[PDB]
């Protein structure tokens, strides 16, 4: 399947996601450090060993991703900064999310 | 594609102990080769030497 | 190598081996179906040059 830019992201907690909005993209103005998350991005994994819970979770939300593989964009290790401008370009047909 | 330049039954599996067809993945089940794709479930380092 | 654009800009070796295997398979088929000898001379010249 395609990828996800949304902020419902595995393996992360409050301390990473406090600097993102409700749709993955960092704010305009958030002064970040070297190694935070700017854009949250997760790619498909798979069910493989679909267990009773895994099979029940693949028919309750109606989504098949599920845990996903973190591939979020990060600030390269060493540089600080202040996010001044965010561009979002969308290939036509794709659902625009709330920040686009 | 079997059996072109990049192969699996000539040169070995792409993933370690990961048979192309997939049937052997036990620690007490090593040495036996595959029957479907006939890929000896071994290591991918052997695609550097065959 | 992938170039992260859906395509593989291949290395030169796979291109060369692919040319040898194309020309060799066409020469096996032309020696199979009894081609006239001028054409299989030309085909062997092409294989030698590949």
């Amino acid at each position: 399947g395609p990828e996800e830019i949304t902020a419902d992201i595995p393996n992360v907690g409050e301390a990473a996601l406090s600097k993102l909005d409700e749709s993955g993209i960092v704010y305009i103005g958030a002064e970040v450090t070297g190694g935070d998350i700017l854009v949250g991005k997760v790619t498909p994994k798979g069910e493989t060993q679909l267990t009773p819970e895994e099979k029940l979770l693949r028919a309750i939300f109606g989504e098949k991703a599920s845990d996903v593989k973190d591939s979020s964009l990060r600030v390269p290790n060493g540089v600080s900064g202040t996010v001044i401008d965010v561009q979002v370009f969308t290939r036509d047909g794709v659902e625009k999310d709330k920040r686009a | 594609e079997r059996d072109g330049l990049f192969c699996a039954r000539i040169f070995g599996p792409v993933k370690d102990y990961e048979c192309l067809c997939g049937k052997y993945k036990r620690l007490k089940h090593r040495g036996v080769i595959c029957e479907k794709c006939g890929v000896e479930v071994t290591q991918t380092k052997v695609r550097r030497e065959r | 190598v992938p170039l992260d654009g859906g395509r593989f800009a291949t290395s030169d070796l796979n291109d060369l081996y692919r040319r040898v295997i194309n020309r060799n398979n066409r020469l096996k088929r032309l020696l199979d179906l009894a081609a006239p000898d001028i054409i299989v001379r030309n085909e062997k010249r092409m294989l030698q040059e590949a």
Binding site: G1, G46, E47, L50, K55, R58, A59, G62, K64 | - | -
Partner: protein, 99 residues
């Protein structure tokens, strides 16, 4: 078109399966036909419950085999293959058939 015949003894389970397969279809492809319920087979059985003799003493059992007919009108590249990895819950015999 891909006709899909779900068969199971538990009806709730079969329902769950059907919904699952619909979900599978609908994200990848488009225009899923729908989950059509066919008639249930109520295969009954009578048996003598006594060791030796009492013929009016009986237990009547039955097995309710439920049928669910799901159809897919447009088989795309992505959709059909999606089912390969997508196995359904145990105790539900599925039967896909394209054309």
């Amino acid at each position: 078109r891909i006709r899909i015949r779900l068969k199971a003894f538990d009806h709730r389970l079969i329902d769950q399966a059907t919904a699952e397969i619909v979900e599978t279809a609908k994200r990848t492809g488009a225009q899923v036909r729908g989950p059509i319920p066919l008639p249930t087979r109520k295969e009954r059985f009578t048996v003598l419950i006594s060791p030796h003799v009492n013929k009016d003493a009986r237990d009547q059992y039955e097995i309710r085999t439920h049928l669910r007919l799901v159809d897919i009108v447009e088989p795309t590249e992505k959709t059909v293959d999606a089912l390969m990895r997508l196995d359904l819950a145990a105790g539900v015999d599925v039967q896909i058939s394209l054309g």
